[PDB]
Swiss-Prot record, chain A:
Function: Involved in a type II secretion system (T2SS, formerly general secretion pathway, GSP) for the export of proteins. This subunit forms the outer membrane channel. Among its substrates are PrpL, elastase LasB, chitin binding protein D (CbpD), aminopeptidase PaAP, and metalloprotease ImpA.
Assembly and oligomerization: Forms a cylindrical channel with 15 subunits. The closed pentadecameric channel is 170 Angstroms long and 140 Angstroms in diameter.
Protein name as catalogued: Secretin XcpQ
Disruption phenotype: Loss of export of PrpL, elastase LasB, chitin binding protein D (CbpD), aminopeptidase PaAP, and metalloprotease ImpA, still exports LapA and AprA.
Family: Belongs to the bacterial secretin family. GSP D subfamily.
Annotated localization: Cell outer membrane
Domain writeup: The N0, N1, N2 and N3 domains are periplasmic, while the secretin and S domains form a channel that is partially inserted in the outer membrane. The N1, N2 and N3 domains each form a periplasmic ring; the N0 domain was present but not resolved by electron microscopy. The secretin domain forms a double beta-barrel structure; the outer barrel has a diameter of about 140 Angstroms while the inner barrel forms the central gate with a small pore in the closed state. Isolated N-terminus (domains N0, N1 and N2) assembles as a hexamer of dimers (i.e. dodecamers).
Curated annotation (Swiss-Prot), chain D:
Range of the intact protein held here: 275 to 370 of 658
Family: Belongs to the bacterial secretin family. GSP D subfamily.
Ranges where the record places region N3: 6-76
Subcellular location: Cell outer membrane
Protein name: Secretin XcpQ
Complex formation: Forms a cylindrical channel with 15 subunits. The closed pentadecameric channel is 170 Angstroms long and 140 Angstroms in diameter.
Gene disruption: observed consequences: Loss of export of PrpL, elastase LasB, chitin binding protein D (CbpD), aminopeptidase PaAP, and metalloprotease ImpA, still exports LapA and AprA.
UniProtKB/Swiss-Prot annotation, chain E:
Function as written in the Swiss-Prot or TrEMBL entry: Involved in a type II secretion system (T2SS, formerly general secretion pathway, GSP) for the export of proteins. This subunit forms the outer membrane channel. Among its substrates are PrpL, elastase LasB, chitin binding protein D (CbpD), aminopeptidase PaAP, and metalloprotease ImpA.
Family to which the UniProt record says this protein belongs: Belongs to the bacterial secretin family. GSP D subfamily.
Subunit structure: Forms a cylindrical channel with 15 subunits. The closed pentadecameric channel is 170 Angstroms long and 140 Angstroms in diameter.
Originating organism: Pseudomonas aeruginosa (strain ATCC 15692 / DSM 22644 / CIP 104116 / JCM 14847 / LMG 12228 / 1C / PRS 101 / PAO1)
Record remark on domains: The N0, N1, N2 and N3 domains are periplasmic, while the secretin and S domains form a channel that is partially inserted in the outer membrane. The N1, N2 and N3 domains each form a periplasmic ring; the N0 domain was present but not resolved by electron microscopy. The secretin domain forms a double beta-barrel structure; the outer barrel has a diameter of about 140 Angstroms while the inner barrel forms the central gate with a small pore in the closed state. Isolated N-terminus (domains N0, N1 and N2) assembles as a hexamer of dimers (i.e. dodecamers).
Deletion phenotype: Loss of export of PrpL, elastase LasB, chitin binding protein D (CbpD), aminopeptidase PaAP, and metalloprotease ImpA, still exports LapA and AprA.
Protein name: Secretin XcpQ
Localization in the cell: Cell outer membrane
Lineage: superkingdom: Bacteria
């Protein structure tokens, strides 16, 4: 989805949902470079305060720059949270 | 006598001031070609031979 | 004009139709037609250029540095860039070509990666 | 006779004409008795005017700067439990 | 050039190939090749 959000009322449009922005850099051969900006947003109906849409605009947002090999499933990021 | 030689790495631009003063203060002459790197020399045969040898030592890096 | 010593014979140029009108001895005619036939042959400052692809580096970024070091390798020296195919156009004598290849082969390396695991414990 | 019909027209692939034309104009001082490389962004072409040795040298430049580039299919994946 | 007093002998430099062409007496040649061999020392 694409939602509004207040910047005052002077609201503004803003995108919510799965997203991916790649920029490669390619050698003549192996070992490509990637500039990844991946994210997963959401939107929350449950925990609403006395205010506007509590837009989970990042729920994951990894903005990294890696250098991979052209058939190799690799791991970019992670989170293990125990409580 | 008259002759023309090549150069592999040597420059006739640098060697022109050399060979003009190769004979003392003229007699012999020397003519440069900086496009085709040619050398036209008009003089004694021993200056020809010794300076072709200096050319062959001169076009070395 | 300086083929005859300090004149006698004469020489007249035509730079539109590339003609040569010479007025003198027949042996200077013959020997300098032979020098003409050796003279209209292509030779140096021709096909002394180079094209270099780059890895892990931009072309213009290294091109400023090579242009700022290439005064000391100077009879002419020209290194220009291309950011489209990330390439580098060299124009130099072959010794300078080999020296700039030694620069380039030691400035284009695959860089290194870090996996960072930060951990936070609270009791 | 000479300096007549010593020109050339080059189509380009995978590259703009003016973008390479600045670079060829900046390298063409060292190939200099006259040298003229101008561009056309309409049909993406490049007009050369040079002696045939310089024409062959600029053809060697052009044939090594017009390549099909490479593609990546990126599959990012996210697992959450 | 000032090795001989005020000329006679001559001397010619090559700063590209670092060559020295000298046209004169053999003892000035020998002693100044020795000064060259002491002269190209840091």
């Amino acid at each position: 989805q694409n939602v509004p959000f207040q910047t005052g009322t002077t609201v503004e449009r803003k995108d919510i949902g799965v997203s991916l922005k790649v920029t490669p850099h390619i050698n003549d051969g192996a070992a490509l470079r990637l500039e990844i900006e991946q994210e997963i947003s959401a939107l929350l109906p449950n925990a609403q305060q006395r205010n506007n849409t509590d837009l989970i605009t990042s729920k994951r947002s990894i903005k990294s720059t890696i250098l991979a090999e052209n058939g190799q499933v690799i791991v970019i990021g992670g989170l293990i949270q125990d409580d | 006598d008259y002759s023309v030689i090549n150069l592999r790495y040597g420059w006739v631009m640098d060697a022109a001031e050399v060979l003009n003063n190769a004979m003392s203060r003229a007699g012999a002459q020397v003519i440069a070609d900086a496009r085709t790197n040619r050398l036209i020399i008009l003089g004694p045969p021993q200056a020809r031979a010794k300076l072709v040898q200096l050319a062959q030592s001169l076009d070395t890096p | 004009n300086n083929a005859m010593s300090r004149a006698g014979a004469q020489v007249i140029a035509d730079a539109r139709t590339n003609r040569l009108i010479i007025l003198g001895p027949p042996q200077a005619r013959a020997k300098l037609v032979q020098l003409a036939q050796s003279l209209d042959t292509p030779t140096a400052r021709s096909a002394n250029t180079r094209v270099i692809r780059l890895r892990h580096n931009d072309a213009k970024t290294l091109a400023e540095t090579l242009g700022q070091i290439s005064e000391g390798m100077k009879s002419n020296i020209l290194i220009r860039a291309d950011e489209s195919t990330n390439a580098l156009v060299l124009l130099a004598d072959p010794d300078t070509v080999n020296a700039l290849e030694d620069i380039v082969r030691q400035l284009d390396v695959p860089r290194a990666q870090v996996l960072v695991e930060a951990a936070i414990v609270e009791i």
